[PDB]
Nucleic acid binder design. Structure first.
Lengths: 79, 92, 106, 93, 96, 79, 104, 95
DNA sequence: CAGGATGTATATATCTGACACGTGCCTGGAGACTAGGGAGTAATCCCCTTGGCGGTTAAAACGCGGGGGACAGCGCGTACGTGCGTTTAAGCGGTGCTAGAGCTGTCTACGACCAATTGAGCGGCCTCGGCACCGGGATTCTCCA
DNA sequence: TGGAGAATCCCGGTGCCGAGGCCGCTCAATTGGTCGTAGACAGCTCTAGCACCGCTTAAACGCACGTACGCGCTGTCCCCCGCGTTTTAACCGCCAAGGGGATTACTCCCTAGTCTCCAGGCACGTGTCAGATATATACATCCTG
């Protein structure tokens, strides 16, 4: 139940950053689901990127290549 | 001499559906589809070989690119065809 | 003698190897890469053409037109998400009706 | 006891600042839980999950902006899950 | 006399199982020549060039109209209005 | 008036193929502007695609490449 | 007697030519293409850093922070159009409120 | 004992040329380097495929100019085109 | 629910243009053999990851009033839906012409490539100043009696 | 609405650790010469893209009438927010164990390259038949009763 470790005010803080004032009480399971499916969409691609290199540790370089696959590229770790 | 992959998918259609034909517009769409998949897979294998500082593209990068840019069961059956073809080819 | 017959495929191994050489993807290319790419194009072409033939079969037609390819692509949720950013000419759209538009009390 | 202006203060505070919002170790172990599903006994760089956290919550706050726009379009101020599947299907997932 | 809302729903199916081009070819051709004259003068166009230009145009049009339809549904309405178009082009990221 | 060459029943037909039932009166020139900016974004790439080739006739091939550049690749016209 | 001196650019020309050569983009690389690419990269770097330093000036710090870079590229319209699909780490978002959200 | 190439000093010289009093952090330095690397890869890949589209085996300055006109929005694109063109004639006028 | 009114699905006649199939030929793929360099494999080591202990406290969990927003219901007035007469421009066919794509021949200037040379560029190191942080006072700022 | 209290801005002081310059080596950038071929230029061909005219015909446009639906208003209740109290798991700091990423060295075999040959794939021509067009008929809904 470590998906629940992303906790009750964490979605609240992310929504306050996103500019949302009032949020529902049933919103948390849904955004936990979308964060979970985003994480298995990215982490799997990072895992095959690691697996191709005959490596058993995941760096940040293949993480940002997996981000580059989905059109969600990240600046600050590709150096 | 216009270069195309028409008759190859004609034999594929005959061995998968031996009692039908295909139109010329659907021929253009099938040729463009297989060309888009070729460009996507070869570009992913190219940058995958570049990422590991390797100058050679072999079946490993093609297999990993297939596992990358195809969805799950489609990619699983794609590698199930690919390694079976490479074992049939390397045995003769 | 033909490498496609040696690999037991219909797609040309030598042509894929040629466009891998002149497609400047790398400085050198291996031997199993063109047969692997030919097998992948084999399987993907067979999978789209099988559902296209089924979409022609239940439409009682012995000819494949782009509407059958569009019906084949969007019905199954695998190749549709494979090529979701692709539009097909003479293709149309799947018949989908949102449930709030139908009249009730009929 | 102000009725509803604490939330606007939180909005201004969190859009003004730029620290990491999701708490560190539960995310760092949730990455381990998802990564166990593909290959077992996986080692992880610290900078890998450091990049993954800023990857995840940037997507999350872009999504929350999108469902905020959907909830405003629905003549409401409270977001429901229906705005979430609005945002996901309309933006293309 | 038909009830308003059911013959349009009837020809929904007629245009939705169909596959030909909705917009007439000549006004789209003239419009394409007008908007392409401003980038470079006295251009020429192939016949399949303006045919491929119309294909993506109506494909993007009905992909946007799916989006505006189910965005106007969410606001407990049936009629599509220009702010659903703003919502579609905003969530898609085409505007901002 | 040539932007108005594509017309009220054509827009209503294209929206009807998109599955709508009722259409407001302010829809039509709004989607006329949407079609105008879409053709701007495509034709601006296509015109320099012909301009690089020492060419002054737009073919169907470079339109396909421009639509591939905007992430909306189109089948049935070669490529 | 470097090539970047005669090109008038502080960006490297030989490094760009080296990355263009063994980057397998094409088998032949022209002479003016690396200096053109280095000029465009110089301009884009200057365009980023000008508004980054300006945002640092309004924030009254003399160090460029990733928040300053995010405020530089998101407040400028074609810069956001070029950088729409990227995310900037430790950069945050623009402070904006919808007009219906304010009370009264 | 390793070697890692980056564009830190070049964008340092650009920064001190445009702002002779402002410093930069190391995280922002890496953001800067990754940004210029990404846009370099974008322009180089578009010029490569655009040369392949015209069956040309050489990437000249015209391919870079056309790829700049494709990947950049309008007045930014022609300002970058002007900077690249004046750099090419400056390099060609010199030996 | 029950009977007309239409639009849609089903069944022949046929007919035509696109599609399946045969033919030459020539260029691109296959057979064979060599060179060498890029990948495979093994030993080292040292950074970096993993695991654990323990104090600290900020943050999460929980509970409860209450108020304001989601939602249901109702009234309305107008703005699009649908139908009909009429105009109008799209579509199709024909001609006719020429600008401009496409390809072939040359050669020359531009780019690959290798040897010799060297200085910009990168790792290590050190220093100090910009900036994060704590604390007290002034400044808004929002709710109410 | 003045003001009580709470959050925020601001200035002064402190201490810290990472920007930023210096130094030494080194390997990648520069220069010079060669030589090979990619494409710039001219010219020929020929083809498809405008350009215009006439018929015809179904699509578009304007208008009349209606009705249903989007929007405004009111009531309700419920559920999420603000805040006080309790608990618990994250954070900081520190310490070892060792794991495998990275580096260097030595081999080997696999693929680029070259020459020769031949047959698979493509342009083109031509029957031919399956979808298009037309006509007739059943039927499955909707509209009003």
């Amino acid at each position: 139940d470590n998906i629940q470790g992303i906790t009750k005010p964490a979605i609240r803080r992310l929504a306050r950053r996103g500019g949302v004032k009032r949020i529902s009480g049933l919103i948390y399971e849904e955004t936990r689901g979308v964060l979970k499916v985003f994480l298995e969409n990215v982490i799997r691609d990072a895992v095959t990127y690691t697996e191709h290199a005959k490596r058993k540790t995941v760096t940040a370089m293949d993480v940002v290549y997996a981000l580059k696959r989905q059109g969600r590229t990240l600046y600050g770790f590709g150096g | 001499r216009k270069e195309s992959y028409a008759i190859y998918v004609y034999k594929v259609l005959k061995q998968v559906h031996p009692d039908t034909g295909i139109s010329s517009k659907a021929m253009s769409i099938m040729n463009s589809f297989v060309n888009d998949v070729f460009e996507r897979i070869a570009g992913e294998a190219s940058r995958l070989a570049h990422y590991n500082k390797r100058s050679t593209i072999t079946s490993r990068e093609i297999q990993t690119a297939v596992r990358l840019l195809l969805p799950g069961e489609l990619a699983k059956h794609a590698v199930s065809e690919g390694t079976k073809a490479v074992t049939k080819y390397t045995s003769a | 003698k033909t490498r496609s017959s040696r690999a037991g495929l219909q797609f040309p191994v030598g042509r894929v190897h040629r466009l891998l050489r002149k497609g400047n993807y790398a400085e050198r290319v291996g031997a199993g890469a063109p047969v692997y790419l030919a097998a992948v194009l084999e399987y993907l072409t067979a999978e789209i053409l099988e559902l296209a033939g089924n979409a022609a079969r239940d439409n009682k037609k012995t000819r494949i037109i782009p509407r059958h390819l569009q019906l084949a692509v969007r019905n199954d949720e695998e190749l549709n998400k494979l090529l979701g950013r692709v539009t097909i000419a003479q293709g149309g759209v799947l018949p989908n009706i949102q449930s709030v538009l139908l009249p009730k009390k009929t | 006891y102000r009725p509803g202006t604490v939330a606007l203060r939180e909005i201004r505070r969190y859009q003004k600042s730029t620290e990491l919002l999701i708490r560190k170790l539960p995310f760092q172990r949730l990455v381990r839980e998802i990564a166990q599903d593909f290959k077992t006994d996986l080692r992880f760089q610290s900078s890998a999950v450091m990049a993954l956290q800023e990857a995840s919550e940037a997507y999350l706050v872009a999504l929350f902006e999108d469902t905020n726009l959907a909830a405003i379009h629905a003549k409401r101020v409270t977001i429901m899950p229906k705005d979430i599947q609005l945002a996901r299907r309309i933006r293309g997932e």
